[PDB]
Structure 1
């Protein structure tokens, strides 16, 4: 209940919220049914539209007008954005030549260049090129400022998850807005686009930019705009706020457009009807920039033009129905559409079996346009599991498709031709970034990057210390003319041990065997050199990874590879080796098929044992440095050390063996040598972070040998592929993966076929950034290179996406 009978007289678009039941005069008031009775009359004037004409020039001020062409308007801050053009012979900003902004050119009283975020819903990356001839204001920002060819949104590629990621630098699993609709099982409440529930603060976690700003004494405009406030009025409100006195004026502003999303849904991304919304958004940018130029702020303000997601061709007829797969379809709730999330209809049910639901949804039709997953099995690059609002069962839907529960859900609601929400690596989902202003570079192209990184940059732009978030601070330094953040490497926490030969063979009782009793001094000092790190410069190209937590581990050197061997987890944390373009693949000789050898540098008590693998009828083992790539028959024995062994499901060994035997050599042929770092990952609580020992839920039967959730590899080479990986003078090129360690290959529908028809497709889907692996391992890679730390931070955030 409000007392809506105060007045907005002198408080239109006031920045401090007045609390119930005084009546309100701000953007939210509409959505709360709490506006004063005169808000429309005073605050939402429309009379005479939004443009000066010659006849209005010099007019007598009439306060009923939407905007003003009177002589006093620049001082009152309320001229129509085109006043100076019509009434004073000035040019539109778009018609002026691009001129470099080397320093901020601000009116007196400006302590810092303001930031304006201009967000556009559904603005697909390729609109920058395909629509360029109708968006001259946007094209100027883009060619004269700093731009990327595209920006990668977060998953799901929906509006609220992405805008709240922009604001926080957090993954949706961390900020809590994990979908455009959601059910919270603790709240027993649903969030939707319609309704008042979405307004409750309990949904929205982390610390958004506007709060970061305010806590540190920097004032912010609104980031929420009521749908009924026309764009022209949002722009005029921002320009009025920018004319406030120094002590009252905000430093950070946002503008949001519902377009082109709203039309894209109706017409598809490139429907003929989409030309006009692009023209309209462009006009709005022109208004803003003419408005800045009137107020002498067009060489002072930093402008970010950014989208939340793209838009794909999706029609009612490309819908998969769960009713065609399940008998028990009335026992589930589905969050439908361009993703699927499934939970039980009733928690008063011990009868609900997710395993039977998954099984009924797996590889059932040859054409199937979705894939089911337990959420902890989703590609770790999606970071989409560690929240109670994400249901255990997920369906990743193919681009261009929808999933629904039953046909009536689609006809008892074709409306639509476009939609979004797919996998964030999908080309059609990519969106836009442009930065223009004194703090951005001039006429500069940067590589594609992720929207999670922008929070740190917006903080830098405003001199704010960012709250803890998921960006990598410094990875986007190359966007900026002047950086206030100087990244430095984390300090190594655990120093390695460097063990020599300390144990006799008969001290081990590991139940292993090997055929290795097959006896020259020229090659007896030569192998000694190898166990002490004589080839270490070849196999460890970027220094040893730093261990960033407290543990006990050993560096072990070998002719063909180096490792960091954990005495706690009884296996390498990492294994590093280089394969040249020239290198040969060889087989495991017959006599060595089951060979495992004690490592005399490592005590029996800190070693794995073969007996446990014999006794564990589910679990087998593989090797991190692959025997197939031994430099010599003699070096091959080192690959069979117990210290190179790791636990592997037979089903996973199909994947791993094909990678090691076929793919590593291919990459070395294509990339002119590769350096590989491989290791295990333990993430039993699916938080994206290295598990402590006491979080491990599975061991090799009757042992302390922990079972990894995942295996990674980081594959690095020279960006200039005319140089070999091991003698690169310049920038590097990387691709990485995090493969789930699963006891079946149900995820790959063609897995009954030869590995050459399915393994690589799997690995591509589980592409990863180096940073992802860092979080999962507590390692820090690329410690010793000739490259700047900023550049290395960009490299660590790169994702190889495998789109055309």
Structure 2
């Protein structure tokens, strides 16, 4: 019904309900615009710039923008009007001056926010393209910037734009790729075409909805591709000239560049200079335009990308047809990641186990690795959605995976792509904030794009919907409007058991070959006399209802679960000077009852003997005991945890070699280790009724993962246990697997593969918090916002 009119309706904010014709910034994309949309709304006459001869002209409403006297009040001047016609300077030529307070026109209730989003803008463009992007360089140097911003996985456009909008992981917002099949709708989502416009795909609450629901007006964020950039900018500036009761407070611009060119020419192709220049010119138009409206010291501006761009060519393609004989029985979502499902749900002869094995470590330099999705690095948060296929391929940077060669030459063309692991340097993107609410000439550490939703809410005075950001962790970007969170309340208080059981009350099937001056000595140790050394940041708080005990020892402190029959956490400090020792021969198979903990709340050695697949390890490593006498404590049944022999190779090397290495490199480290149970791969602590595996014959639950949090002084001239200032952390969440199939070199010595495994499984403290229902760093001398920043830190081990 496109015989309605867009007269006086151009770029209307409220989308009219068809079958009435549309005049909003998306109507082109649904082929739904009124007949006169182009004529009235996409004027082009005379181009985009005032010239000296158009100054003071009589208004001609055919023109794309105006150079008449009345244009400022009307809000439709070309962005260079005051420069060309009133001898003003371009914004970029003006010195930076601190913006201490919003300098807004009367009637503005809050500083507007404008998000300037750029597709495929790789983080290193800020330095490498700086000579050709002066407007962007001024935003960056005068505002608040990060060296880079980490996207989410997969590092594709729609997952990342919707993460920016919602503060959610793709698994939670449901946009898990640029292409998807949802088995409960039995429907497909694609970039091309129209099913993606169906609202059932899009979960959580995006910023524009959050705004609307709380009485803040929002501009429409999505722009049809054919609307020229100049027109997008002029539309924003027109909206900003609306009356107070109609004018939005939040706007987004989007550019398809430099992504579009990057795919064709590679991230640093010589052809990339012009797209970067053109983007910079658009930023300049916006800023000149704000300046003429007296809004350039009023508005907060965010310059942000969705992902970066890597060099990728046709010839760097792995073909599943080279591995699988059965290739026509699978559907592959291809490219910079792979997702595999059965071609037909009626094929009972499909077996994911046999596909995985056919794809595992088959060629010496194989450029992808298969995973069941629950085994992917937990830092990716890429499993808890039915739209994510069980079988996943993590593709090496610079490579593609495809089903058959004909897929790649029956479509070389492209030189750039993205989608890879979000740790990869080429995938990193940008963040700049400029305005009254951002800090002045401030650099901040790199951070994840899941955090920005909360900040954008802070900037608009909105209460954010529940999301995966850690609200407060980006307070250091802001001059004001910080969010002041309180530490969560401890839900369960610990018991502190003393000696309550005699040795002969235990029938655990365990065995161990085991003065009065230092008899008091060991009593004080068991009462917590060394605890200030081994528990540096306070005990972790337990944020759920459970029954647990604090157990003190010479070398380590633990919070021992009576429910899970093992520690939730074990804490210990290893100085620079500490010595590694062996497990003495007499103690090789030693497990000792803990006379503080009932036999009924203890593990037993007979279960491990019976269970031919499962062995055990220790959370506090016997190798790092302070003394031969202290070493007995490490063999308590309360320090034992279930470990597959294959995993013990990993764990033993970490404990015997790597902990001491870190303590030497970082001037002591504090370590907190423990189990994780996430059988439903939702990234959250399992309740006891969610556990799918026990040690045979017992109530001993088997962890899905083992974590460690390794903390030291950021100023490494100070020892970990005597640190005056900011901390440094690195953490991991290691999968507890019965094989080392993940590691193709695992036949080799652990010095050749364990550390690279651990790096792959690097984690944020926050990730561990979700997975354990523990809250760490409760008792430091640092600000809580600083600790939140520390908890979101990821050590990426990239160059």
* Structure 1 residue ranges, 4+ long, deviating more than 3 angstroms after superposition: none
- How many corresponding residue pairs? 799
SS in 1 for 2:181: strand
Q: Over residues 461-505 of structure 1, what are the superposed CA-to-partner deviations in whole Å (9 max), with x where a residue is unaligned?
A: 000000000000000000000034101100000000000000001
What CA distance in whole angstroms lies between the structure 1 residues aligned with 2:202 and 2:694? 38
> Is the deviation greater in 26-35 or in 744-753?
26-35
SS in 1 for 2:215: coil
1:78 and 2:76 aligned:
yes
1:729 and 2:729 aligned:
no
What CA distance in whole angstroms lies between the structure 2 residues aligned with 1:94 and 1:308? 25
**Unaligned stretches of 5+ residues in structure 2:** none
Q: Over residues 57-80 of structure 1, what are the superposed CA-to-partner deviations in whole Å (9 max), with x where a residue is unaligned?
A: 000100000000001100111000
SS in 1 for 2:522: helix
**Unaligned stretches of 5+ residues in structure 1:** none
What CA distance in whole angstroms lies between the structure 1 residues aligned with 2:678 and 2:398? 32
What is the CA-CA distance between 1:367 and the residue it aligns to?
1.0
SS in 2 for 1:574: strand
**Residue equivalent to 2:309:** 311
Q: Over residues 390-424 of structure 1, what are the superposed CA-to-partner deviations in whole Å (9 max), with x where a residue is unaligned?
A: 00000000000000000000011111000000000
> Is the deviation greater in 480-489 or in 330-339?
480-489
Q: Over residues 362-402 of structure 1, what are the superposed CA-to-partner deviations in whole Å (9 max), with x where a residue is unaligned?
A: 00000100000000000000000000000000000000000
What is the CA-CA distance between 1:571 and the residue it aligns to?
0.2
What CA distance in whole angstroms lies between the structure 2 residues aligned with 1:463 and 1:735? 34
What is the CA-CA distance between 1:334 and the residue it aligns to?
0.4
What is the CA-CA distance between 1:185 and the residue it aligns to?
1.1
> Is the deviation greater in 31-40 or in 307-316?
31-40
What CA distance in whole angstroms lies between the structure 1 residues aligned with 2:412 and 2:183? 33
- RMSD of aligned residue pairs (Cα, Å): 0.5
Q: Is the 8 A contact 2:475 2:482 kept in 1?
A: no
**Residue equivalent to 2:765:** 770
What CA distance in whole angstroms lies between the structure 2 residues aligned with 1:131 and 1:193? 29
What is the CA-CA distance between 1:349 and the residue it aligns to?
1.3
What CA distance in whole angstroms lies between the structure 2 residues aligned with 1:231 and 1:57? 24
What is the CA-CA distance between 1:799 and the residue it aligns to?
0.2
Q: Over residues 190-229 of structure 1, what are the superposed CA-to-partner deviations in whole Å (9 max), with x where a residue is unaligned?
A: 1111110111001000000000000000000011000000
What is the CA-CA distance between 1:124 and the residue it aligns to?
0.3
**Residue equivalent to 1:396:** 394
1:292 to 265, 290, 293: 290
> Is the deviation greater in 281-290 or in 15-24?
15-24
What is the CA-CA distance between 1:186 and the residue it aligns to?
1.2
Q: Over residues 744-782 of structure 1, what are the superposed CA-to-partner deviations in whole Å (9 max), with x where a residue is unaligned?
A: 000000000111100000000000000000000000000
Q: Over residues 10-60 of structure 1, what are the superposed CA-to-partner deviations in whole Å (9 max), with x where a residue is unaligned?
A: 000111111011111112211122111111100110000000000000001
1:622 to 617, 621, 629: 617
What is the CA-CA distance between 1:785 and the residue it aligns to?
0.4
1:45 to 43, 46, 53: 43
What CA distance in whole angstroms lies between the structure 1 residues aligned with 2:662 and 2:16? 62
Q: Over residues 444-472 of structure 1, what are the superposed CA-to-partner deviations in whole Å (9 max), with x where a residue is unaligned?
A: 00000000000000000000000000000
What CA distance in whole angstroms lies between the structure 2 residues aligned with 1:168 and 1:532? 48
> Is the deviation greater in 19-28 or in 310-319?
19-28
> Is the deviation greater in 184-193 or in 340-349?
184-193
Q: Over residues 130-161 of structure 1, what are the superposed CA-to-partner deviations in whole Å (9 max), with x where a residue is unaligned?
A: 00000000000000000000000000000000
SS in 2 for 1:333: strand
Q: Over residues 661-685 of structure 1, what are the superposed CA-to-partner deviations in whole Å (9 max), with x where a residue is unaligned?
A: 0000000000000000000000000
**Residue equivalent to 2:570:** 575
SS in 1 for 2:555: coil
Q: Is the 8 A contact 2:509 2:606 kept in 1?
A: yes
**Residue equivalent to 2:551:** 556
Q: Over residues 160-185 of structure 1, what are the superposed CA-to-partner deviations in whole Å (9 max), with x where a residue is unaligned?
A: 00000000000000000000111111
What CA distance in whole angstroms lies between the structure 1 residues aligned with 2:19 and 2:316? 49
What CA distance in whole angstroms lies between the structure 2 residues aligned with 1:483 and 1:359? 53
SS in 2 for 1:259: strand
SS in 1 for 2:165: helix
Q: Is the 8 A contact 2:472 2:482 kept in 1?
A: no
Q: Is the 8 A contact 2:709 2:765 kept in 1?
A: yes
**Residue equivalent to 1:796:** 791
SS in 2 for 1:257: strand
**Residue equivalent to 1:167:** 165
Q: Is the 8 A contact 2:149 2:428 kept in 1?
A: yes
Q: TM-score, normalised by structure 2?
A: 1.00
